[PDB]
Each structure stands twice: as structure tokens, then as C-alpha cells.
Design a protein around this ligand. Structure first.
Ligand SMILES: NC(=O)c1ccc[n+]([C@@H]2O[C@H](COP(=O)([O-])OP(=O)(O)OC[C@H]3O[C@@H](n4cnc5c(N)ncnc54)[C@H](OP(=O)(O)O)[C@@H]3O)[C@@H](O)[C@H]2O)c1
Ligand SMILES: NC(=O)c1ccc[n+]([C@@H]2O[C@H](COP(=O)([O-])OP(=O)(O)OC[C@H]3O[C@@H](n4cnc5c(N)ncnc54)[C@H](OP(=O)(O)O)[C@@H]3O)[C@@H](O)[C@H]2O)c1
Ligand SMILES: NC(=O)c1ccc[n+]([C@@H]2O[C@H](COP(=O)([O-])OP(=O)(O)OC[C@H]3O[C@@H](n4cnc5c(N)ncnc54)[C@H](OP(=O)(O)O)[C@@H]3O)[C@@H](O)[C@H]2O)c1
Ligand SMILES: NC(=O)c1ccc[n+]([C@@H]2O[C@H](COP(=O)([O-])OP(=O)(O)OC[C@H]3O[C@@H](n4cnc5c(N)ncnc54)[C@H](OP(=O)(O)O)[C@@H]3O)[C@@H](O)[C@H]2O)c1
Ligand SMILES: NC(=O)c1ccc[n+]([C@@H]2O[C@H](COP(=O)([O-])OP(=O)(O)OC[C@H]3O[C@@H](n4cnc5c(N)ncnc54)[C@H](OP(=O)(O)O)[C@@H]3O)[C@@H](O)[C@H]2O)c1
Ligand SMILES: NC(=O)c1ccc[n+]([C@@H]2O[C@H](COP(=O)([O-])OP(=O)(O)OC[C@H]3O[C@@H](n4cnc5c(N)ncnc54)[C@H](OP(=O)(O)O)[C@@H]3O)[C@@H](O)[C@H]2O)c1
Lengths: 169, 169, 169, 169, 169, 169
């Protein structure tokens, strides 16, 4: 069994993240999806809690027909020591074989620990990114179009737009 | 949507835990399953990591035909302040309505925070419990019979029996 | 018994803070006063320890004829998870009914937890603020005029001016 | 100004603690009263939160004719390093001169740091201990007689008896 | 360059520890010596601080003619997650090849991370151990005979005997 | 015995640091050398782990004819409370008499705790700084000339240049 790993803040989970996930699932048996910076919530850049993001991913991956047997969703708090972060991930996850990341630090930390590291198979443009999603939430743009409908439903239930607007005042 | 919550160490996940989960799913729409004491591993009482237990639950719940849309699996480290533990759970989980626990502390902490609390719908006997599973792993008893086959496969992959035997020497 | 809560760094406690406190005491029976960022000391923005600020508040509130039965003074360290901060405050304080804050994050965190939140009854201008107090301490301005005399006496005893001047070299 | 320091769990604050405090106030100008093991709540031995104990002390000291100018009340969480605990206390408190404790560890830690240390001036009777108070709360004995009435009122408001009884099931 | 690693509380450093270290230096180029449980001090089982033990080791290894080029002395605080402890050690130490330990948990943690692990080359009897050293310090036995003289000198300077006797009252 | 203390990030240890250390050793019997910000690694400003820097210092001091009896090397992680940092250092170090630092915060923290504080006896040339060393590692300049050869050997073994280059992409 070949297991990949992906790590991102996913503030919130959007269609781009999902496109990337589906591409990775073409080349691994199972994908471990880590929600990074799980300690951060209630800011403009990081509005949603770990739990809210777990909810987003769980609903979206189940809405899009990906069998439950092919993924794991794990929240991962940041830690002060970069030299321990890979060990931290490892403790919180199933065993894995390959890490997907475009980030130089994430790449180098995993490489130094002996893991195979590769760039994600797809890169999405800025206008589909979290920055754009959050800006549209703030400015009454079309944020819903950038998310799976299951994520929209989460954001509606948790009053996510109201939160981010209040925090920006 | 009515969401229940359950919390246990699940060292390891066994058939009893699963029986209880299925009973709860008769009376809630979705169940949030928290893996408690997620910081504890590599002892006789707590042999498996957070990640290994996430793997166990993920594989078992998917093996037994429970749709992914009906549950969430979340590791929860213990914390030094009992008065903060419910807040800690809340941050790490989707919103929920009702807590299932037989434990007086867990009950009282959740009750004081305004949640509905009830006992689990089923109680399994000691001979099906984690204590018995771990004893059988140590003593070459029939531990496999007490677990879903998907969990057995996890324990085989992570060399769980070898670990617990070494730790007991 | 109707209890309010206020939270601020109070670096140091000045006449503006006191004016606000007295206005709040017109509309609550008791006021819980939390010294925020209690972990921060010995910087230009945050010169004084938690203990020094406890001393400042204790002396000032006693000097100004407010009965001891009407307030509580509690140091509160910041924490990494915004989603837990209200729980953290709750553990450290008596039960309370209403929060007074002008800060959007503090407001939203408390409102999400179900508390009534309102702006402070008074807003003081910048020239009476901590920034101005600290600048005057550094530049040999009239910092004493901005503080209750009881706070001046604390600052003299702990060599606060000497400290901030050394730190700014 | 001569300042004493006292530290205790005060689970809960009882008439004994108050007798000792009054006795110390005959020998010092001001007393810093620290609530130790502030992180512990919701157990049989340590039922009450830091905030609940702050409330108990604040009410009791104000309702017994001790002027506010003569004391400070500070919650102090335990920490893993004994060699840092005096530094921890110091950060959280006004400057002080003398420590009152009968505990050999507390005495030695403070003595090593250069503080004068002395035993409490009074040893209260066996009836006034926290063990007895908590037993009576559990067994429907006369716990109220062992406490200042202001502390009784706190225990009523926070449902302290109901908590301890539930926890003991 | 072949580097070994050893880890122990060394409360205090005694002749037995030194005998073992010298035996290990027969089979490695350099030895990384970690002072475990570096957070623990001022108890009967763990009387000495991390710094005091660093001093003990530094002086003893220098007194006994072992060249400085052949060892490293590193204090290592315990951590709550066993699954991260090897990563923690790795961050704090030079790169190493082999671990020497008789402890089943230490062995298994390092073996799971891919290190070669072996028992120490020598086992000393109980009458030469830390337990015996500390008992003799308490009971006015011949503790000095169990230590290198350089360690005795550290213990005299830090008033170690006085400390342990006070703590035992 | 007169013991000095020095603290620095030493990212990496260079000929300047060694010049200063030798200069201090003219004025004290023994020098405690603390590696500050020990938690920081794998960034452009702080590339090396605590362990890698311990290795650098251990090798450099042993390869320059300083007797082992004259120094101690101790990693010190930063902590959130400035008011505890001196206590933190003290716990981790042998007893000391005098602190050498040009940093206003370090000076004031130690001075407040009653230590003698003095500036380092030498200020090394601009060429020997860590900023320059790291720039040269990145830009294929002559970084080796700025370091003791023993430190070069450490940087080669740990692939320090490859790390810093990858991190800068
Ligand atoms: N010491 C530690 O604790 C430590 C060390 C290393 C990393 N980490 C954590 O690891 C997590 C991941 O690190 P990261 O640097 O990747 O952070 P990140 O914030 O999750 O991602 C960085 C940026 O890349 C974007 N992105 C990701 N995949 C993309 C793709 N396939 N195509 C286009 N854009 C893409 C993200 O876009 P969106 O805005 O659309 O999401 C984001 O803007 C973080 O939570 C970080 O804190 C922690
Ligand atoms: N401050 C804090 O951090 C804090 C506060 C409260 C609770 N917690 C955590 O919350 C988690 C859960 O607490 P817990 O007391 O329930 O611990 P637990 O160790 O998960 O469960 C206690 C015992 O009950 C058994 N059990 C559970 N459900 C049962 C059922 N339906 N029928 C029969 N036996 C059953 C378990 O059996 P098995 O051996 O078969 O699993 C175990 O022996 C723990 O990880 C605990 O540490 C943390
Ligand atoms: N995750 C967490 O730990 C967390 C989350 C939320 C908040 N907090 C903490 O909560 C504390 C309070 O938050 P805060 O944002 O209010 O910080 P703050 O540092 O206390 O100050 C807010 C700003 O508003 C000013 N101010 C306050 N009341 C005023 C009034 N009535 N009129 C005019 N100006 C007024 C203060 O002035 P002065 O300079 O005169 O004081 C300061 O400049 C902080 O310590 C923060 O760190 C922590
Ligand atoms: N590293 C650390 O974090 C660290 C290090 C040292 C100490 N501490 C903390 O410091 C606190 C102080 O320790 P402690 O053991 O004294 O706390 P404690 O829980 O108050 O224990 C003292 C015991 O003696 C009793 N007592 C105290 N003063 C008395 C008097 N004058 N007459 C008669 N009986 C008296 C108390 O009775 P009652 O039951 O009636 O109260 C209690 O049973 C603890 O919270 C401890 O954890 C922490
Ligand atoms: N999660 C974590 O933080 C974690 C995980 C694993 C281990 N650790 C730490 O790692 C450290 C070392 O673990 P440990 O179990 O070896 O603890 P330890 O306290 O150093 O002692 C192990 C026992 O074996 C004895 N001993 C050691 N070497 C011996 C020899 N060659 N012959 C005879 N007796 C010998 C020691 O005797 P003496 O009394 O003479 O010293 C002690 O009684 C501890 O500080 C532990 O806390 C931490
Ligand atoms: N609360 C806390 O945790 C706390 C509080 C206070 C301090 N600290 C820690 O203490 C450490 C010490 O602070 P620091 O700013 O001095 O560290 P630092 O990173 O070594 O900064 C000193 C700067 O001055 C240079 N320098 C030092 N001594 C010199 C000399 N004799 N001649 C010429 N240049 C010299 C260094 O050069 P190079 O680049 O060549 O090294 C560096 O650029 C830090 O790690 C800090 O975080 C922590």
C-alpha cells in the first residue's frame, strides 16, 4: 500500500485543494491529508478552527464520491521546533511513503528525515486560492463559487462570513 | 442535523467499541469519535500512537459499511486543566449536540458546559475490552478474535505485538 | 449578582483605565478585571510583569475608594489557540454575565461562546493612553500626571523608568 | 513595607486558612496569598477551579474586615520544573520579603533563592481541614460550619456539592 | 566517525556511570551523553538540577583523562509524547549511529526509528547505584566513596546533602 | 572559582565568537557558553539545530587548546516569559558570577536578578558575523575562511550548505 501525505492550512477548504487531492489519488493508494496550523483560528488569514476544517474536509471528500478507504484527515498544530515537526506529523498519522508539497521548508524537513518528496501534480491559480475566498467573504464577492457546496453548508452553519466580517472591523 | 460525540483511548480499537458506535448511529445523524489520550503511546496500557489509532478507526469504520458522511475521527490530547478540556474538544470538532459517556468526570465536565449527556446505549463485558486485548497480545492469546480484521491488519503492519512484548520485558 | 468582565494589558495601569472601570461599576454589581498578556514583560510595549500590574491595580482600586467587594483582579496569560481563550478566562475567573471590550477579536470570541458583549462605556483619547505613558517614561515627559499616584509609587519601587530606559538602548 | 507570602491549594478556602492569614497579618504589612495547584479542578481532592477559589478568597477577605490595601490574591499553576517555581511565583506577584510555609519543598526552594522562610504562626485544628470539608460535602455532613459564610455562598452558586457528588459516582 | 548515545538521569553522576561510559568509549569514537529528566530537581529521587548534573559530568569526565574531543554532554527534558522523544533527542544532539540502553522503552523507541540499539557493555550492582548514593546522603553513610571526587566537590559547593536532608523532613 | 556566562545564537559558530570566548577566559576561571534560541532551526537566519550547534562548539573549543575544565556548553530554548528566562538559564547551568552581554534585554534581566553584567571584552570585525557567513554559504562565497576548520567539518557532515540553499528557493 502506497500512502501519500499532503499538508495545508486549508482556510477554508476550496475547489483547488480538492482538484489537487483527486490528482494525487491517481498515483497513490491512500492519501493522508493534514490540516496544518490547526491551533490558528479567528483571524483574517486563519478564520476557522481545526474542528471546522475537519468538518469541511470530511463533508467535501464524502460529497465527491472518494471512498473513505482512500484517505485520512488529521489536524496538526504547528510547533516551535522545525526539527521536530516531521516527528510530530509521524506520531499523528498512519505510516506513509511520499510527501506532496511545493513548500521549500516542508520539502527539506521531510527530505532530511528520509522521505520521498515531490511537488503537487497540479497548481491552481491565485483567483481560486484561500486568499481570494477570504477576500470575497469579506467584500460580498462570489466566495461560494470557489468552494464545494458541502463546504458552503459548513460555512453557513458556523456563521463563518459573519465571523470574518466582525474580525475585520 | 443531530450530532453525537464519543471519546475513548481505544488502545486498540476493538469489536466492542464498534458495537457501541453502531448503536449510537441508530439515534444520531452523525457521530464525532474522539481518540482520547492521543499523546500517550509505547506503554503497556497505551501502546499505540494517535496516528495508529486514527488508522485503526478509519479502516474499521470503512470496512463495516458505515457511510463516511456519518462520522468524524479526531485525535484529542489530554490537557492539564479539566476546566479547559471541553473547550479543547470543541475547538477540535464539528459542532455537536449530545455526548455519550459512562465516565463521571466526562459527564460532569460536559454537563457544566451546557451539553446533553447520556450513557452509551450498550455496555460490553471485560473479556471484550482493551485490557483483555492487550493481555492476549502479551500472552499469545487470541487477540485477533477481539478486533475487526481491518484493525488486525493495522496491528500487523505496525508490529504492535512485537512492540508491546518488548515494552513488557 | 450581575458581574462584568474587562480585559487589558494595562502596561501600566493609568487614569484612563480607571475612568473606564468606574463607568462600568455604574452598571454592574461586580467587575472582574483581567490583566491580559500576563506572560509579557521587559519590552518597550510591555514593560511590567504580571505581578507588578497586579500590584498597580490592587493599590489604585484601593486608593480610589472602590470597595474590595466590587472587583477581582486576575492575571491571564495569552494562549496559542484563540478558540480556547474564553475557556481559559472562564477557568481563571468567577462566573460572569457580560463582557466589556472594544476589540473585535475579544468581542467575537465571547459572543460565539454565548456571552453578552458590549463596548466600554467610555473611550479615552490617545494622549492619555499606555503608548503615551511609556513614551513619556522614555523621554522624561510628564508620565506621572497620567497615572494614579498609587501606580506612580509602584513604578518608583520597581525602578520601572530605569528598566524601560535600559531596554530602549 | 514588609510583605509576606503564603501558598496553598485551598480546596476550598475554610476558617482555618482565614485564622492563619489573620495571624500572619499581625507580623507583616501586606500578605500575598497564592492559590497553588491552580490548574487542578474537578477531582475529589481538588474540586474547584482557580477562578472559583479566587472568588472564595476575594469574598472571604473582603467580608472579614481586612482592608484591601493589606493583601493580594494570585492563582499559581504548578509547573514541571521545581527549579523555576520560585521565579514563576515572583513574576506573578508583588515584591515580597518573607515566605510562610510548613512544606519542606516550598521552604527549600525559597531559601535557596535567598528568601527568609518561616513556618506559619498558627496550626489550625484538625476539624478545619479541606479533607474534612470535602468529606462532609460528599456525606451530607456540616461542611458549612467549617467555612466563612461568604465561601458557602460561592459553593452554593457554583453547585460545588452537586459537582463533588457526581464526580464520586 | 562512529558516535554512540547514552541517556540517564544521573542523580547524581557516580562511579558506576563512569565505568559504563569508559567501556562504551572502547567501541565508539565519540559518546553523546544525555542527562535525562533534565526538568526534575529538588525531590528525593531527583535532587539535582540539569545544570548541576552538567557540572558533575563535565568535571568528572575532565578529571578522568577522557579527551574533550570524545564526548558531548546534553541535558534533555522529558516530554509528554513517547513517539516524539527520539526526535527531541535528535534535535538536541550531534548525529549518532548507535544507542546504548538497558531500558525497554528507550530501546524500542530508538529501534522503531531505525537506530542500532544495544545494552550497555557493563551492568553495575545496586550498592553502587544512585538509589544507594542518595540513601547514604540522607543517612550519613559513605556516599563520597561511590562518587568521583570531582562530583563530591560539586555536591559540596551546591549544598546537595543539606538540600536532600531538608526535602526529606 | 569565578565563572562567566555568555549567550548567543551562534548560527553558526565562527572565528569571532571564538576570539571573544578566548578574551573572556583571560578574566574568568570558567566560562558557561549558552546557545540561545536553541528551538530555532531550518530558516535563513537560524539554519542549524541546537544539536548541530552543540557539536560545532564542542569540536571548536576542544580543537583550539582550551582545556575542558574551563568551559561548559549548554543549549537554551527561548521562553515566552522574559521574567523567567534568567531562572531558566540558572536551572540549566552551573552556578555563575558574571554575565557578558552587549544586549540590553539580557543585561537588564540579569542585573535585576542581582548578577554582575559587563559588555564582551572584544567586538569582532564585521567580516566575522553570522549574517556574512550565511550569505556566503548561499552565494558560494568563502564561508569556510570565517570559521574554525572543526566547524567547517560539522557543516560538511550535516549538509548545511545544501540545507540553506534549498530553504532559500
Ligand atoms: N514547525 C512547524 O510547526 C511547521 C513547519 C513547516 C510547516 N508547517 C505547517 O505546514 C503547513 C503547510 O505549510 P505550507 O507552507 O504549505 O502552508 P499553506 O499555508 O497551507 O500553503 C502555502 C500557500 O500555498 C498555496 N498552495 C498550496 N498548494 C497549492 C497548489 N497545489 N497550487 C497552488 N497553490 C497552492 C496555499 O494556497 P491556499 O491559500 O489556497 O490554501 C497557500 O497560499 C502550514 O500549516 C505550516 O504552518 C509547520
Ligand atoms: N483533562 C483531560 O485531559 C481529560 C479530562 C477528562 C477525560 N479525558 C480523556 O477522555 C478520554 C475518555 O475518558 P474515559 O474515562 O472514558 O477513558 P477510557 O480509557 O477511554 O474509558 C474508560 C474505560 O471504560 C471502558 N468503556 C468505555 N466505553 C464502554 C462501554 N460502552 N462498555 C464497557 N466499557 C466501556 C474502556 O474500555 P476499553 O479498555 O475497552 O477501551 C475503559 O476501560 C480519555 O482519554 C481521558 O484521558 C481527558
Ligand atoms: N489567544 C489569546 O491569548 C487572546 C485572544 C484575545 C485576546 N487576548 C488578550 O486579551 C487582552 C486584551 O486585548 P486588547 O486587544 O484589548 O489589548 P490591549 O493591549 O489591552 O489594548 C487594546 C488597545 O485599546 C486601548 N484601549 C482599551 N480600552 C480603551 C478605552 N476604553 N478607550 C481607549 N482605548 C482603549 C488600549 O490602550 P492602552 O495603551 O491605554 O492600554 C490598547 O491600545 C490582550 O492581552 C490580548 O493579548 C488574548
Ligand atoms: N513545581 C511546582 O509547581 C511546585 C513546587 C512546590 C510547590 N508547589 C505548589 O505549592 C502549593 C503549596 O504546597 P502545600 O503542600 O502546602 O499545599 P496544600 O495543598 O495547601 O498542602 C498543605 C497541607 O497542610 C495543611 N496546612 C497548611 N497550612 C496549615 C496550617 N497553618 N495549619 C494546619 N494545617 C495546615 C493543608 O490543609 P488544608 O487541607 O485544610 O488546606 C494541607 O492539608 C501546592 O499547590 C504545590 O503544588 C508547586
Ligand atoms: N517521553 C520521554 O520524555 C521519555 C521517553 C523515554 C525515556 N525518557 C528518559 O530517558 C532517561 C533514561 O531512561 P532510564 O529508564 O534509563 O532512566 P534512569 O533513571 O536513567 O535509570 C534507569 C535505571 O537503570 C539504572 N542503570 C542505568 N544504567 C545501568 C547500568 N549500566 N547498570 C546498572 N544499572 C543501570 C539507573 O541506575 P542509577 O540510579 O545508578 O542511575 C536507574 O536505576 C530518563 O530520564 C527518562 O525519563 C524520556
Ligand atoms: N525570553 C527569552 O527566551 C529570552 C530573553 C532574552 C534573551 N534571549 C535569547 O538570548 C540570546 C542572546 O541574544 P543576542 O541578541 O545577543 O543573540 P545573538 O543572535 O547572538 O545576537 C547578537 C548579535 O550581535 C552580534 N555580536 C554578539 N557579540 C558580539 C561581539 N562581541 N562583537 C561583535 N558582534 C557581536 C551577533 O553576531 P553574529 O551574527 O556573528 O553571531 C549578533 O548579530 C538570543 O537567543 C535570545 O532569544 C531569550
Amino acid at each position: 500500500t502506497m500512502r501519500g501525505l499532503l499538508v495545508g492550512k486549508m482556510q477554508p477548504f476550496h475547489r483547488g485543494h480538492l482538484q489537487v487531492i483527486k490528482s494525487i489519488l491517481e498515483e497513490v493508494d491512500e492519501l493522508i491529508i493534514c490540516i496544518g496550523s490547526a491551533q490558528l483560528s479567528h483571524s483574517i488569514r486563519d478564520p476557522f478552527t481545526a474542528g471546522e476544517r475537519v468538518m469541511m474536509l470530511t463533508k467535501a471528500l464524502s460529497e465527491n464520491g472518494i471512498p473513505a478507504s482512500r484517505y485520512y484527515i488529521i489536524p496538526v498544530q504547528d510547533i516551535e521546533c522545525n526539527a521536530l515537526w516531521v516527528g510530530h506529523i509521524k506520531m499523528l498519522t498512519p505510516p506513509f511513503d511520499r510527501v506532496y508539497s511545493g513548500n521549500p521548508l516542508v520539502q527539506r524537513l521531510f527530505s532530511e528525515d528520509g522521505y520521498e518528496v515531490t511537488a503537487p501534480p497540479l497548481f491552481y491559480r491565485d483567483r481560486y486560492s484561500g486568499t481570494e475566498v477570504r477576500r470575497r467573504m469579506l467584500d460580498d464577492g462570489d466566495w461560494r463559487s470557489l468552494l464545494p457546496e458541502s463546504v458552503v453548508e459548513v460555512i453557513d452553519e458556523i456563521n463563518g462570513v459573519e465571523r470574518i466580517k466582525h474580525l475585520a472591523k
